[PDB]
Design an enzyme around this catalytic site. Structure first.
Site, PDB file in Angstrom:
ATOM      1  N   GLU A 180       0.826  -1.198   0.000  1.00 21.23           N
ATOM      2  CA  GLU A 180       0.000   0.000   0.000  1.00 21.23           C
ATOM      3  C   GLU A 180       0.863   1.252   0.000  1.00 21.23           C
ATOM      4  O   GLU A 180       1.851   1.341   0.732  1.00 21.23           O
ATOM      5  CB  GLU A 180      -0.909   0.017   1.226  1.00 21.23           C
ATOM      6  CG  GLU A 180      -1.984   1.080   1.181  1.00 21.23           C
ATOM      7  CD  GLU A 180      -2.438   1.508   2.558  1.00 21.23           C
ATOM      8  OE1 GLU A 180      -1.591   1.991   3.335  1.00 21.23           O
ATOM      9  OE2 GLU A 180      -3.639   1.371   2.864  1.00 21.23           O
TER      10      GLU A 180
ATOM     11  N   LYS B 178      -8.775   4.638  -1.861  1.00 25.49           N
ATOM     12  CA  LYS B 178      -9.299   4.087  -0.622  1.00 25.49           C
ATOM     13  C   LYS B 178     -10.576   4.809  -0.227  1.00 25.49           C
ATOM     14  O   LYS B 178     -10.644   6.039  -0.251  1.00 25.49           O
ATOM     15  CB  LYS B 178      -8.263   4.200   0.492  1.00 25.49           C
ATOM     16  CG  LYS B 178      -8.527   3.292   1.667  1.00 25.49           C
ATOM     17  CD  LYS B 178      -7.303   3.163   2.546  1.00 25.49           C
ATOM     18  CE  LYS B 178      -7.389   1.959   3.462  1.00 25.49           C
ATOM     19  NZ  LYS B 178      -7.890   2.314   4.811  1.00 25.49           N
TER      20      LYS B 178
ATOM     21  N   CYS C 203      -5.352  -1.965   3.039  1.00 24.24           N
ATOM     22  CA  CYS C 203      -5.262  -2.029   4.493  1.00 24.24           C
ATOM     23  C   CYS C 203      -6.606  -2.303   5.161  1.00 24.24           C
ATOM     24  O   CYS C 203      -7.338  -3.202   4.738  1.00 24.24           O
ATOM     25  CB  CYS C 203      -4.660  -0.726   5.020  1.00 24.24           C
ATOM     26  SG  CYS C 203      -4.360  -0.725   6.794  1.00 24.24           S
TER      27      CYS C 203
HETATM   28  C1  LIG Z   1      -4.329   0.938   7.383  1.00 23.38           C
HETATM   29  O1  LIG Z   1      -3.816   1.237   6.331  1.00 23.38           O
HETATM   30  C2  LIG Z   1      -3.698   1.083   8.702  1.00 23.38           C
HETATM   31  C3  LIG Z   1      -2.435   1.645   8.819  1.00 23.38           C
HETATM   32  C4  LIG Z   1      -1.848   1.778  10.065  1.00 23.38           C
HETATM   33  C5  LIG Z   1      -2.513   1.357  11.193  1.00 23.38           C
HETATM   34  C6  LIG Z   1      -3.767   0.803  11.086  1.00 23.38           C
HETATM   35  C7  LIG Z   1      -4.363   0.662   9.846  1.00 23.38           C
END
Ligand SMILES: *C(=O)c1ccccc1
Ligand SMILES: *C(=O)c1ccccc1
Ligand SMILES: *C(=O)c1ccccc1
Ligand SMILES: *C(=O)c1ccccc1
Ligand SMILES: *C(=O)c1ccccc1
Ligand SMILES: *C(=O)c1ccccc1
Lengths: 317, 317, 317, 317, 317, 317
Positions: free
Chosen positions: E47, E130, E164
């Site tokens: 990501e 996202k 994520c």
């Molecule tokens: C999601 O990208 C995420 C990044 C850092 C911590 C929690 C979630």
């Protein structure tokens, strides 16, 4: 609720002393006594057995039936307070056998195709009336209510009972399944009318109706019917044409399990008698694994039933 | 309940000794005795027969009637404790005939259009008051209540009784039908009032009412009536105009079967006498094959009757 | 509501082209045109006029009727959206006359004794079905519901319509009175069945039913009837015996005022034609001075009516 | 709506090339061509015919079926936009015959017991999914909506189609009757499972179901079924025990009229082929005389149906 | 739609040249080349890989991050028409491999967590953003759109991609299942933040999120992740506390089958490299026998999704 | 609503006396008593615990299960009015502990996987049914409706319960989150089915489902499970093949916090017992900071849920 009990039932394939309540009630009590001597917990009798089915409405025009039979048929119908009914209640009490006998109830001046559910203790469990008679039968009898569609928790099993072509009523079927029958008493008359011409009246047609009821609802069906014997011809028929209309026989008393297979060897279409079977309610929980119209095999989000059980009366007071 | 009994009834088309209770009671007793001599076991008498119908309210202004007839008419009305009622009871007992005589009952200072039901045992079976007097009679008479609509189980048949223009009440008729009456006594006055101008008051109009009652409810109707004879003119009429108002004749006593056919040859609109007919209750079970308003033509899911048969009194203790 | 209007109405005493919708629709349109020429604001037609009344149910056994006439009758029954119904609407529009024609409506495989009420503008105001057929008539027609008991506020008067023995049902009559009916169309079939031996079916009995309807409700009754002509004999009956069952004539179309006196000269029982009369609603007010079953001359604290007008359907969705 | 048309129909008692869409589509088209040569306006095929019925779910445990047949069955199921479905549409267009073929439709990764209804013009009239599979079929198939319970107005008649034990769903039957179905296609698999032990799965049970459907609804039932040919044994069975579970034959394709009598001579249970009959919709109006569950022979004031025909989807967007 | 293809995929667990687009694009192309040499039809990258994940938002207060890293990170974000994106497209074209690379797209003065999807022909199949940055990424990234939830029909399979914690979106996952994924690319950053204190940020939690995605939707999940190498510490952290905030490693890239079992041996949490596996889409039809949240295992009558897929933009022209 | 309460819960990894309600209810009450001795405010029990899970549907073919186990399992299923259910209510009241026990309800002739929610006061808070059983479970169990997805405001917390593989239901998850759960009871059977062949049925896959449920919805999850011990093998398995189908063990009872961390040390897959934990609802408020699928971290302008929570019935009266 419970599918454990085991017991014995009797189905009666008999004819009545035509339009003679006193003689036919005597015949019924003897049939009640015979079945009780066999250890049966329930004995069923044909539809409108006590006075007998009014075949005169099928064999001739309305005026011919009205002139010759209407008064006699009406006079031989049983009021619920009549001594004849009390004789049936006493007979069930004495022999300790539940009786489902179809009478022709008289209420004032109208008649109804009533079924009397008599408990082994001699109590009248119910006197349901046919919801809607069939074809020209509607000229003789009146209609029932939604209170006449019910299932009664008899000590041996949950009992229901419908008359003749109430087995072609799709919604009446579902209402009876929704109450969880496991013994059904199906009363028919001698289904020998118009045999060559109208197949829908043939014993074959009404055997599918009764077999499907057990198969569709996963219930034991106790089928009792009348027989159109030569004695009937000497009563209704006046010539050769009328004798063709009500053929001979027409009796198809059966006992059918939840799987639709007959539990008793059927009699002849013309022979009278009683046939017996052993009912094991565990045979239903086996049949309900595949289908259950009111249970797992239903879609209430798509199809549902509106059932009104109010007992409507012409005068509410 | 039962439609087998056969018997004979009498319908009286007579005029009373106008506003004279003692004289009219003698005339009634003689008519009661005459009918019993003919083998009848039910004799019906006209409406408000004993003192006679108060025509003065129709042929003159209220002051004319009040000033000349009110006190006389009220003084001649029968209280239930009066000796006159006892004479009627004794006459029924002695002659062993059921009497249905319409009187002008007096309670305190008010009058009611009562009908007395007297059985062959000489006992007052019932005392029913008219539920709603006709538009001008409401000045003279009071009002009954629900207890005044009833059917009485006489030894010979289930008897009911209604007064003039109680046969125009659709709901009162249904209440009477719902109670399974098979002999009806329709008490009428001489229906000659305002004859040229108001057809609704002609005997033709009141014959359809009684005939329809038998047809609609499959009842034996025993119609009885008063006659407006010249003796009446010398009592009420004071000039030519009043004689035109009160007309003359107006008697239309009949005996109607359940099919609406007359069972006795009618008398003349001005003649007096007693009709006779043979009542076979089995004739009803023939009529009820076609129609039965409270039986198999009822649709209580659609139309029902609220019948409040409780007797209401001004003081309830 | 308002009792001041005046208009001209027509009662048709016609015999249809037996079991031929297209032919009888042409016959009806011809009758509609004739009445409009005479200046009538309303023309009424007999019961189940378009295909014609099914006398075959009365003359022989059900099997004879089913095998010979059932399919022909069913195929000649009008569907609501059928072109035949549209032609009736067009005729009413073109001739600017309100029509009340009794058709044999077909819905799926079922028939109902419908009465189409068509206003002068060519719109279908009502499609009421008979609340309950009579005797063997129930074998051939279904029954309607409470939504079929209604009066419609036509431009000329508040119009209601019952057909056949619906005038023998007291509760249905009261429901119509309660809705303040003032012009009534009473569709009948040719009442000539069983004349010697069933007087309840004779035109005399059915004339008292219609006459009493006018008297009770204080309404104008436009009674229309079919006629059993020799063409009917060639169609239905094939024996000397059956020709007696289905008598000759039977037409008794009439126009009756609120006083019960006819406003038009009756035709003959075997004559075929149209009746005319001038309706003055002020005549109703005169009748209502004496009697009003739903108004001043009622006892709602004693007798009331439970009227359920819900439009029930086999499938709700 | 109209019960006059006449036509010829064909019922197929065929063997699928098990779990091979391309070959089974070829066998279907040849069957379609054969029926069209005989002038049949409708040819019907068994349920999940094109890939074949998944008998492996009944013979062995779920793991045995999943590891052996699941992927093969899943990969041989037809998506709606598949070339195989187009060939069925082309065949129906080319031969001018309406086809009702059962397929195992694939939607994403789920299978449904779909029935394709194809008119003579080659259009997809409808694609209905089984409302609820039976027993262990629920492990291989999904459910449909109320939009899958429908009756389609084909040029020749109003056609509806259910498959397998949707004929035991009593409320589903009533919904079909309410839409005036008059030609019904009943698609079954080879009903030969568990014959010694479970009689409810025998062809005798399923013939009463289809026969009762015609009697209740007064419709023509075109019953089409598969056959368990020895080729099936070589495909599913692996030992003697499994060959007993999936018995031989099991085909009972039939054509039966509204009276319940077969219009075509049945084949043998193990035999394969097609059978033909001539359908005259006038025969329905004869059956409608006695019974009509949704018309004259119904009590909507007592029992009614809530039918939800909404087309629900997992994602609305 | 089709579940038969077989192919090879690569999952990259790589570290970016922190906030250096030019050098990180070079590293990406080398990783693209390496995967193509191994015969992989699809290679996925972590990501926000190209500039690298902005860990500075987590380690220190917003002012510290804004003053030191915001401008540099913003300046190294990729525009859609930038040469860097063209190099990624050229690499995918030259090596004939589909690339799913996460970038921080720049649109004017705003950044977005975009995922570029590039086919083997070098065309930009999709550019999805996202839907919602997780917790404090909302300060540095803008929200996505309803059109950024989509499934793309690549030549090798139907591909989808989410970033994520977008895997904790119950409804977003369902929207993707409804579009029938069978290959899913799950891009993550190095999940080592706050490791002792916030266990929800540990690779253990994010491994269940990716595994459960494969299980729910029966898809192949190509999980790709970054790594917090010591080089990352030299970039973001200036204290010992900050070096504790972002732990070490955090990479958990792996390939998961529809049964949830890993198809490739996972690397170490600190190691870098590429994971290879062979994807057989037939493994899904086997997994969809048990569960199918959008097909046979859904209740659209109870629960359904409202999916708005419109492209909302600030200026609509 | 409130996230402050602190309490203690117990998760049960037990084994029912296979298909014996009486002995299994005793085992449950002892487990209830044991937990209350430890101060636990809530004790949860496995899926369909009281009669036990019907493993026979997995080991053998449907006929083998039907013939050998169907009647036994049906007869040992608890009716909601049965004395056994009252014993569970009494146990909860006596020991003042909330009980969430999975039983097999028997409504008429169908079975349902129900969770009984019992409060410390002995009242039946709810009896939710499983919305849709899994794979062949649909052959033995019925379906619930939207009323069966609810969260109950227990005195100690807001509690919800779901059965095996309702945690793979994406939309059911969201419905539960939208009602603000903070204690979830996840009832499972012994997940030891087809372990070599079907990874999705292994405890590893089912631990991600429960763990993901806690992480995704930020709720405490009380996972309870049955165990396939040798006693089960002597009950279901009849040979070596069937003994491998249901492997030993399968118990994975856990207590999981909002962050996915286990709050209690897990037992062995074969070990049987109870495990306790202390629940602090403030731990959720800490987890809601990162994610909240129905709150701050949702986009209802893009994705929303349609939830039909109506309580559908086969007969609606
Ligand atoms: C999601 O990208 C995420 C990044 C850092 C911590 C929690 C979630
Ligand atoms: C039903 O009772 C029936 C009787 C005679 C003929 C048909 C139906
Ligand atoms: C009824 O008693 C009556 C009397 C006079 C005129 C009309 C009706
Ligand atoms: C009504 O239509 C009717 C027909 C025949 C006899 C009596 C009534
Ligand atoms: C229906 O397809 C069915 C199959 C097997 C047993 C019963 C029904
Ligand atoms: C869920 O109840 C389940 C049971 C057996 C196998 C898979 C899932």
């Amino acid at each position: 609720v419970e599918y454990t009990n085991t017991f014995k039932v009797a189905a009666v394939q008999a004819q009545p002393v035509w339009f003679d309540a006193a003689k036919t009630v005597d015949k019924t009590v003897s049939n009640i006594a015979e079945a009780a001597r066999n250890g049966c917990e329930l004995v069923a009798f044909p539809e409108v057995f006590i006075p007998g089915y009014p075949y005169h409405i099928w064999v001739d025009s309305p005026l011919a039936g009205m002139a010759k039979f209407a008064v006699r048929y009406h006079e031989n119908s049983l009021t619920m307070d009549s001594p004849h009914v009390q004789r049936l209640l006493d007979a069930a009490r004495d022999h300790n056998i539940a009786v489902v006998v179809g009478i022709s109830e008289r209420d004032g001046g109208s008649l109804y195709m009533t079924q009397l559910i008599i408990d082994a203790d001699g109590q009248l469990v119910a006197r349901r009336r046919k919801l809607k008679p069939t074809h020209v039968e509607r000229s003789v009898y009146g209609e029932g209510n939604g209170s006449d569609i019910s299932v009664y928790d008899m000590p041996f099993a949950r009992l229901g009972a419908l008359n003749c072509w109430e087995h072609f009523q799709t919604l009446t079927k579902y209402a009876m399944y929704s109450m969880h029958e496991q013994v059904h008493v199906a009363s028919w008359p001698g289904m020998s009318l118009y045999q060559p011409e109208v197949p829908a009246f043939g014993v074959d047609a009404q055997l599918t109706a009764t077999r499907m009821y057990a198969l569709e609802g996963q219930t034991f069906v106790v089928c009792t019917t009348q027989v159109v014997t030569p004695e009937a011809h000497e009563f209704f028929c006046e010539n050769e044409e009328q004798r063709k209309l009500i053929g001979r026989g027409g009796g198809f008393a059966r006992i059918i399990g939840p799987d639709g297979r007959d539990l008793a060897t059927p009699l002849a279409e013309d022979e009278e008698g009683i046939l017996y079977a052993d009912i094991d309610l565990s045979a239903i929980t086996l049949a309900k694994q595949a289908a259950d119209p009111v249970g797992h095999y239903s879609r209430p989000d798509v199809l549902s039933l509106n059932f009104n059980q109010r007992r409507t009366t012409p005068v509410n007071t």
